[PDB]
Amino acid sequence: LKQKNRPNRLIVDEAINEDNSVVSLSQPKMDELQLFRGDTVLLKGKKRREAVCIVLSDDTCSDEKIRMNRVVRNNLRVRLGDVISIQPCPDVKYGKRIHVLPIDDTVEGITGNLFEVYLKPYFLEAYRPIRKGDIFLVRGGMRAVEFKVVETDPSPYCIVAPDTVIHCEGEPIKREDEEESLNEVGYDDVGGCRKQLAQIKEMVELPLRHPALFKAIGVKPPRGILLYGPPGTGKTLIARAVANETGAFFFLINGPEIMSKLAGESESNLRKAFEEAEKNAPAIIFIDELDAIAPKREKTHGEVERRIVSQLLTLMDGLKAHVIVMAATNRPNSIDPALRRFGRFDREVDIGIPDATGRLEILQIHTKNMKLADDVDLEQVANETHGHVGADLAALCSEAALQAIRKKMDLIDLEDETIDAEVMNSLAVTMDDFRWALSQSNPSALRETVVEVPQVTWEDIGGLEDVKRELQELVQYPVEHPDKFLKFGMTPSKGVLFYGPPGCGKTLLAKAIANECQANFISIKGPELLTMWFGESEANVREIFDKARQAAPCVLFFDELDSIAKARGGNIGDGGGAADRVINQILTEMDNVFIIGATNRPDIIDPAILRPGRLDQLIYIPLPDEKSRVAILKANLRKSDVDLEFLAKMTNGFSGADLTEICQRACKLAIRESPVPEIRRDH
Amino acid sequence: PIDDTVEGITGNLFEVYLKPYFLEAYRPIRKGDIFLVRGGMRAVEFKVVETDPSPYCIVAPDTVIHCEGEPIKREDEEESLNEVGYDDVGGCRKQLAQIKEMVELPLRHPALFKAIGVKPPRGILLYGPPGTGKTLIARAVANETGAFFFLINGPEIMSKLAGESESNLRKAFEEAEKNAPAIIFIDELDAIAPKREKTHGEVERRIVSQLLTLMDGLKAHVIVMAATNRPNSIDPALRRFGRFDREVDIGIPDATGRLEILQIHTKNMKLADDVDLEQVANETHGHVGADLAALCSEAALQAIRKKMDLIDLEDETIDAEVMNSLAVTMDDFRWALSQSNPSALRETVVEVPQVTWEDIGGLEDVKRELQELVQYPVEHPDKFLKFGMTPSKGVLFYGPPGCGKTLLAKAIANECQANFISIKGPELLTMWFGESEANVREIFDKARQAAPCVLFFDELDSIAKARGGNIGDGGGAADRVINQILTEMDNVFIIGATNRPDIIDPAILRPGRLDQLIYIPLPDEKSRVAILKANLRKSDVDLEFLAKMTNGFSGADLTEICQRACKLAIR
Amino acid sequence: VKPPRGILLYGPPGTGKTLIARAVANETGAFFFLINGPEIMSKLAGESESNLRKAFEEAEKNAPAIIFIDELDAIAPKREKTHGEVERRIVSQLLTLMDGLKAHVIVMAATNRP
């Protein structure tokens, strides 16, 4: 077979290092290419373009791929996935002169000395290699300025050294059409989502980047991508990035916006919109608040309201260089079921709320243009914003900066004129400023504010009640080896009930098996579900089981199972009996596998229908702590000379895990007030 | 090559198509023949412009093959093979058999009706969930019968301005008649006719009525075919005889049905030898054609992304040879199966076998009371048509939990070739007030359609406990709905219920014409536990007689959990 | 950086929400433009939205400005209480006009509660 060309052709992948001068390869590639830790390289891409960078190693990069930030990627006129060639460039030398100008639409709004505020800091002893025609970004004064290299003395490339003179002759050049602003949405402006982006990326990869493929092929690419998640999750941002990032044409449609046109004038717009997206395909049509246009279920009513949906349905089926449609809503239920009908919005992606790491990520993205004082601890900020979503975090940053602007600059008073760069550049947001902004809180998101972390409680502990791994071996094959069940015909354990009195670590045991086995977790509660109105409660149960299957293998842990299903003799209502029957239909639903772990006081509490084989077939009892078990629970909750933990343990005979955790928490609070553990146990 | 079959590709077809197709097969060809060849994820049509030994000959290893670079244009009367056909439909069979004979005469022998005075079916209604192939079915019957086809889509009609919408319905019907024999397929019908309780609009109503009028206006015949998810959705008016008087329920495929469907959607692609479609078919229980097609499409795109994609030979003018070499692997289907979405309320396996406890040991011999009861009604339906005697209408099954009551009803259905429709009491009662009664009437109606059949209610006592425990406006309405459906009956369809005892069930259910018969079935002895252990451990020191002797008061599920746990511990 | 764009005022009637908004404007040399729900919602269909736009459009001409929508819920109640191929067409219109913002002009609205 005809083999491929030279080995120095790499795919352009994403960057790990946000610096404009570096690109990363893998060590084995650096060898095969004979390149070293800091070697300056010559990068060739499209439209006969080039760039000069510094090459570092990256153990997470693959031999074939090359990591490079959006600045270089643009200087080269390539998109992710594209291929460029790399060649060493040791002949490069120290620069003499350098002429650079700012791109007009990146300095509007400011006045001052950019050289001092931007160039000077940016280059300063970094020895950045630059090729003429390069466009680079510099962040500061709460914004980013774009600069083009108009000419370098040692032409066409050179290194900017402490001696290199830098001219900046006062006239801002106008941007050229094919020169995308870096101030545009990119995958690098999205944090938290990863798996979702991975999916969406591969979904649009071919149709939007390799259209001819479909002219020559007969297979059907996904046609509509539906985005689920609460407000401010970044659905719009995500869609806009994929478009930019893929050179795709973008066209935004907004429900409220469409739904405010006069009857008929509204549909004419939907059509005119679709019609235009096709003119410029490959293109992405993003319908914003979709449910603002298609709710039909039970909430639709209007010889226009209906006439519109239908119009959207028609327009959808009318599709098939491809153009993809992306819509956004808070959840399935909102949307007209018709929009799902295969050839329409046949693909779905649920953008949840970030995890701890996700927020840290998002925080960084929204503070990249501002000067943060050394006391700023974003990890802390990330750690305390549990149920926040990107829109929240962004607002948090915006407020902390405006607060900073009001104390500092503001009181000195140098506003309302034509804001000076140097001023905005010196000002720094302090941890104190983020503290002020955190002061008020508003998002009551129904979920924890911490990503997949650790656990620790009672692993190896003392004598009596040894480790019995019945629950471990049950979810061993299904959760860790999902492909085994695909090739086999045997049925694994569908659901595992957990009989035990209150505070027996039933909820802690299910959450520990999920985190340890890399399975996704989705905690349902019986008191929370029953508190909802008649039949929105059943809508929450179907939305919980559907979300667990999306991130399978998973573990849907029902907390107080008996409050939802007590059929036996205590059940008495048209809504209570409808909720237990909805849980029996969802349990029979199943068969990557997703197990369902319930918990209750005893077998008598739960309904007899829940036991019926295919649902909860397995069972596991778990009781009270002995003497030695109370020693283990006290050490866990007091981890963060006269203190005898063995003595306090011996006196706590019939204590449980929460009793010892309340004895250590009260003992530490009494120490802060002023022996401490004595005061708490005496109350 | 026929031009509209090679657009999109570039490359050497001869190598990619002709060469493989003929290669040592000695295919006989007559001049003017048009033949199809599949590959590179598509099918190319070729016409035989001339053969040396004219007008027919065999293509042998020596036969020279010219392919002079210009693609001829298709001729009107030369239907593309890339068209929907009965061969592009899988799963449905009995439904197609029905529809086929329904349109056979009117669409193929119109004059018959010019000379005759009998009325052919006028409207055919198609029931089934989305992606079942209703549209595909209708489009095929049309093509397959040379019939003229005209598609109408609800959403599409219902988006026109008021009045502009009806003008279209008429213009549509009016055109189907111009080209009759023709088939008019209304797609999402319920998008136009829901009237029941959900209709509301001096336009919404004005449309339905318009459809009704247009329907009655019918009578070379043109047939109307519509599609919806179920009766309930549609306006009852559409049923009124002379309109949609014929109905066909396209269920979800069975195991075999999926295997079939899978094949159809992978005929144009190169599958690696490791691809096991039977496996794929076996694990996609409640899927429907639209699902399976999506599954294939995704497995191929996934394959395209790893292979071709990374080598990178895209965005240009895709070369046949490339697309032709690429092969989807079982690994690719594995990736595509990775996510799942259809929560279809049904099993994912066609009429298969059973096996559990046939001939087994001493004690509790085989008593064929239930066998002889459903012997005459299920196997010999024509006997009851010519006779006046009444067979057993319903057979109750008293017994404690895990007594194989559900396994006994499912075994009598599969063995006697009867259709099965498993209703559950916990599943029906979980539904909202009165959609639960709509599910009970839809279950009994589906069993009569595929009669002889056996509607097996699972936990009968949860639906009907009248005696003294019943207390609700919805619970009493559900038990009365089950008594009206039981009295409904009289090919016969028996109804087999199951409960703990007579005290649990309602006294109204016993009343002769409903559940007249009864059959008690208890616990396993020593020898019975040996039979249940061997059945669940079928798939030298292991003494099955020793484990059986120690399990005194065990049941069938206790021995099946002892063998399943013993095998998991060995792993 | 982005400054707050819409300020919503909660409280029962006669709490001084309008007075508060009018003061902040005067007190800050800002241009003020009052919009009143009942007032907008009494115009003929279409004539009503034309006014919302004409209002927003004017506040921008004289920015920095403050647009105070008085009885807001008289225009945007949608939750479960919205019903009308005009009633809905208006809210949507307000939503559009809102997103259309971004010398800044701030929007202040008043209602009894979320």
Ligand SMILES: Nc1ncnc2c1ncn2[C@@H]1O[C@H](COP(=O)(O)OP(=O)(O)O)[C@@H](O)[C@H]1O
């Ligand atoms: N994952 C995220 N990464 C970065 N910013 C985010 C993210 N999620 C939300 N944001 C921020 O919040 C804003 C959300 O706006 P948008 O995506 O249009 O949400 P919505 O349409 O629901 O109001 C974004 O403009 C962005 O500034």
Ligand SMILES: Nc1ncnc2c1ncn2[C@@H]1O[C@H](COP(=O)(O)OP(=O)(O)O)[C@@H](O)[C@H]1O
């Ligand atoms: N029985 C079947 N055999 C082959 N393909 C099927 C079958 N059922 C569904 N499909 C596939 O799924 C698609 C279903 O489309 P269609 O029949 O128009 O369904 P619907 O109108 O409900 O969305 C078909 O185009 C076909 O590709």
Ligand SMILES: Nc1ncnc2c1ncn2[C@@H]1O[C@H](COP(=O)(O)OP(=O)(O)O)[C@@H](O)[C@H]1O
């Ligand atoms: N906090 C307050 N301070 C001074 N006057 C107030 C205050 N609250 C209410 N008022 C008086 O009551 C009137 C309230 O009118 P307005 O603010 O327009 O309330 P609303 O629009 O709800 O009827 C004001 O005009 C003012 O005279």
